[PDB]
């Protein structure tokens, strides 16, 4: 399963992460409902001060959460990965600044899915927008990422593009290039190549005085086209 996914699902989240030697730890908590392709995550820095902007750790802060249709459930790598999981790699382009390099487990503890995640950050610039804290606390468009077989690696891959608003104007373009493998060796999907359409909303807590980020996602599969869609359907009866 897939069958693990059925209902609401809580998540625990931890980060540990380097960015120019400036080390910083983020845990964070909250659930999933893939039925509906919805999470919501509240996420803490327990170090203090966030050395990053938060906006800039959204996506390496769980797909295994996006809604597949009845008609694609044969897609989904993310939960036939599990219960023993998978690994999320990524590298981060920053444009004119540094790179995050993370590698996270995807994984259920008990009932608990998890997301343990490593993360180091070189080369950045101290009074860059990403170390000078100079985005916006926002979210962007939504959007849509391209997920591609990876059958060397028995898993998938993808690269996409986010932007972030730069205070007073302008983007901040991070060029993301990530790859999942499953952990253990039982069977596993390599699917088509289709999008997941991702919108998300970044908000706070006015009750915690912690340093933190509040995020809900809302994530769908869909075929390359919708010509590919019909074609799901008619095969599905």
């Known amino acids: 399963g897939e069958e693990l996914f059925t209902g609401?699902?809580?998540?625990?989240?931890?980060?540990?992460?380097?960015?120019?030697?400036?080390?910083?730890?983020?845990?964070?908590?909250?659930?999933?409902?893939?039925?509906?392709?919805?999470?919501?995550?509240?996420?803490?820095?327990?170090?203090?001060?966030?050395?990053?902007?938060?906006?800039?750790?959204?996506?390496?802060?769980?797909?295994?959460?996006?809604?597949?249709?009845?008609?694609?459930?044969?897609?989904?790598?993310?939960?036939?990965?599990?219960p023993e999981g998978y690994v999320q790699e990524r590298t981060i382009f920053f444009k004119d600044d540094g790179n995050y390099k993370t590698r996270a487990e995807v994984k259920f503890e008990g009932d608990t899915l998890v997301?343990?995640?490593?993360?180091?950050?070189?080369?950045?610039?101290?009074?860059?927008n990403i170390l000078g804290h100079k985005l916006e606390y926002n979210g962007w468009s939504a959007h849509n990422i391209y997920i591609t077989a990876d059958k060397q690696k028995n898993g998938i891959k993808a690269n996409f593009k986010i932007r972030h608003n730069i205070e007073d104007g302008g983007v901040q373009l991070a060029d993301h290039y990530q790859q999942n493998t499953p952990i253990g060796d039982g069977p596993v999907l390599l699917p088509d190549n289709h999008y997941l359409s991702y919108c998300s909303a970044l908000s706070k807590d006015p009750n915690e005085k912690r340093d933190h980020m509040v995020l809900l996602e809302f994530v769908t599969a869909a075929g390359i086209t919708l010509g590919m869609d019909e074609l799901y359907k008619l095969e599905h009866h």
Not at 40 to 69: D, H, M, S
Not at 115 to 128: A, C, Q, S, T, V
């Open 8 to 82: 609401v699902v809580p998540i625990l989240v931890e980060l540990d992460g380097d960015v120019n030697g400036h080390r910083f730890s983020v845990s964070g908590e909250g659930e999933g409902d893939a039925t509906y392709g919805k999470l919501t995550l509240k996420l803490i820095c327990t170090t203090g001060k966030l050395p990053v902007p938060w906006p800039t750790l959204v996506t390496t802060l769980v797909q295994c959460f996006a809604r597949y249709p009845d008609h694609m459930k044969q897609h989904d790598f993310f939960k036939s990965a599990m």
């Open 115 to 128: 997301n343990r995640i490593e993360l180091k950050g070189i080369d950045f610039k101290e009074d860059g």
